[PDB]
Write a protein that binds this ligand. Structure first.
Ligand code: CA
Length: 594
């Protein structure tokens, strides 16, 4: 068996790909990895790969040449993977070049499975016009803008979620440490992966919550979703398991997951898009949402999302709707929607506005993330999250967080505990975000403190999704569903959310779970918070509320003034809680909430 890898083939991308792929591949003895690359080969370590990896072949050529497709044997290849140049100055041109690759490959052999990266959502949509593009039969498009900004969006609801999800398809060996440090418990959580498996016929007729509890208690498996088709994430009491239901699980090894299969014994007004999946308003002219610094200072905002954008009129477009849209999912109540305030170049942001103008509660302060006056005007110290992004052309981004941290407010307080997530292009630059951690350029991103705490994200963590998708493309579908707020045909044609009137059928689409974070200082889980065990909390949340818990966000220093928290995914039943812990969970929509 063999796969063909093409597109952006460099020493960096080849090595990174092989690292992911060969960690996950259980039958690597019998799988040939064939790289096809355009320019002549400088033995850019072409030779070393030939030593280290004896099942890795290189071919000079293009997937646009039918003879080169015959030379690498596309007709009998298990899949063709297309790596994008993620940092291209012109994402539309890069996407078009990869769509052309798909067209050429599919012309040569229609039934070849293709997995491709796409930079922008609007280009992903063009693949549907290729007749032989068959997503049902395994053709996959990994959209980088959609996923990266989705991961970030959900992290505005529960900080650390981006890290947790990333680590569920990180294909690295579990690493152990003996001492009782924060790293120990983080690393126990890192060993988890997402799997799918059919549910035992013995579960048929039982409710998801019942089966989920049985999996947790009896099998030590965390089941998060099912598919009869679309994926239901933590469905409630009324949803019963049918024959041939596929379960989605989080576990330490694939062997454990097998137990789940073998188990024995308002009416006149348009307020939503036409599907009822997202909040929607009539298109506003950008002048209606632009604030001056004085105007912004008059309205005190709190619980809001401040989005700091580095970029000028000439920058490549980010696709900011990929951030905003999940934060406008219809399974949020209008009143709980987080106000989004963009701080950056108005001539940049004017170019994004066409695909943002139907989302409510969006403001723009023309200015710069480095201006303390702008940040004070938008109440940076009271926000639920500050997101720091750069448009395509790290030091600007890093400087902005350092600047925020050192600001003083109001007893005067610093900005050191302000919630921030910074997008980095270069993994190495994670070293400069925190001043109280161990730095090393050779240490991978996932082990660093900013990543472990969910204060840094890089599109590079999505690279491993390519290998993950090859081995199990249900994992991509789950991740996309979770981070985008749920889902496409109408958007593929129009490239815009059309408004629509509410019916019973469109309003029923509101009833799906949302990401949230549970505190343990008071309320019904406080007794368990005080030295109780995670498993009792999990069962109580699930039985009483159909609330599914999937980890802890724990204080690094659980005497200390540091409020930094790190992710602990899928902890065991007996794991001991502390009162300051926050719990990652999926909560049911509550229609009567007020
Ligand atoms: Ca550092």
């Amino acid at each position: 068996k063999h796969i063909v890898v093409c597109g952006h083939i460099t020493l960096e991308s080849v090595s990174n790909f092989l690292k992911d792929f060969l960690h996950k591949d259980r039958d690597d003895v019998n799988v040939e990895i064939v790289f096809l690359h355009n320019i002549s080969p400088n033995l850019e370590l072409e030779a070393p790969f030939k030593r280290h990896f004896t099942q890795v072949e290189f071919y000079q050529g293009s997937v646009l040449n039918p003879h080169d497709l015959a030379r690498v044997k596309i007709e009998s290849a298990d899949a063709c993977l297309i790596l994008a140049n993620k940092y291209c100055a012109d994402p539309d041109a890069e996407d078009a070049s990869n769509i052309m690759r798909v067209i050429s490959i599919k012309n040569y052999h229609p039934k070849i499975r293709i997995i491709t990266q796409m930079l922008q959502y609007h280009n992903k949509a063009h693949l549907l016009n290729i007749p032989s593009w068959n997503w049902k039969e395994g053709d996959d498009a990994i959209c980088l803008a959609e996923l990266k900004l989705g991961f970030i969006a959900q992290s505005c609801l529960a900080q650390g979620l981006s890290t947790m999800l990333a680590n569920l398809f990180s294909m690295r060996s579990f690493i152990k440490i003996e001492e009782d440090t924060w790293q120990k418990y983080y690393l126990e959580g890192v060993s988890n992966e997402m799997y799918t498996e059919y549910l035992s016929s013995a579960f048929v007729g039982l409710s998801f919550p019942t089966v989920c509890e049985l999996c947790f208690v009896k099998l030590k498996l965390l089941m998060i979703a099912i598919e009869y088709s679309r994926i239901l994430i933590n469905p409630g009491n009324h949803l019963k398991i049918q024959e041939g239901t596929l379960g989605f699980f989080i576990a330490s090894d694939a062997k454990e997951v097998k137990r789940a299969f073998f188990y024995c014994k308002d009416s006149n007004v348009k307020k939503y898009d036409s599907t009822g999946m997202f909040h929607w308003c009539a298109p506003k002219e950008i002048e209606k949402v632009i604030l001056t610094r004085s105007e912004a200072a008059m309205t005190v905002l709190s619980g809001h999302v401040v989005v700091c954008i580095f970029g000028d009129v000439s920058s490549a477009l980010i696709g900011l709707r990929n951030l905003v849209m999940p934060l406008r999912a219809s399974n949020f109540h209008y009143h709980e929607l987080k106000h989004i305030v963009f701080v950056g170049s108005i001539e940049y942001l004017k170019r994004e506005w066409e695909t943002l103008h139907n989302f409510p509660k969006v403001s723009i302060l023309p200015g710069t993330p480095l201006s303390r006056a702008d940040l004070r005007a938008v109440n940076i110290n009271l926000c639920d999250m500050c997101v720091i992004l750069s448009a395509n052309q790290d030091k600007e981004c890093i400087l902005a967080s350092l600047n925020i941290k050192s600001m003083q407010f109001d007893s005067i307080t610093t900005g050191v505990n302000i919630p921030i997530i910074t997008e980095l292009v270069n993994d190495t630059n994670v070293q400069f975000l925190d001043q109280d951690d161990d730095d090393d350029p050779d240490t991978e991103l996932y082990l660093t403190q900013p990543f472990a705490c969910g204060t840094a994200f890089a599109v590079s963590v999505l690279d491993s999704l390519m290998s993950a998708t090859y081995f199990n493309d249900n994992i991509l579908t789950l991740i996309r569903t979770l981070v985008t707020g749920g889902a496409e045909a109408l958007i593929a044609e129009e490239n815009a959310l059309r408004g629509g009137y509410s019916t019973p059928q469109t309003l029923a689409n509101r009833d799906r779970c949302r990401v949230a974070q549970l505190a343990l200082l008071d309320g019904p889980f406080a007794d368990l918070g005080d030295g109780g065990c995670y498993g009792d909390l999990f069962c109580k949340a699930l039985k009483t509320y159909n609330m599914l818990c999937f980890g802890i966000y724990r204080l690094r220093d659980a005497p200390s003034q540091c409020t930094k928290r790190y992710v602990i995914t899928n902890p065991p039943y007996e794991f001991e809680l502390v009162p300051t812990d926050l719990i990652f969970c999926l909560m049911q929509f509550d229609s009567n909430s007020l």
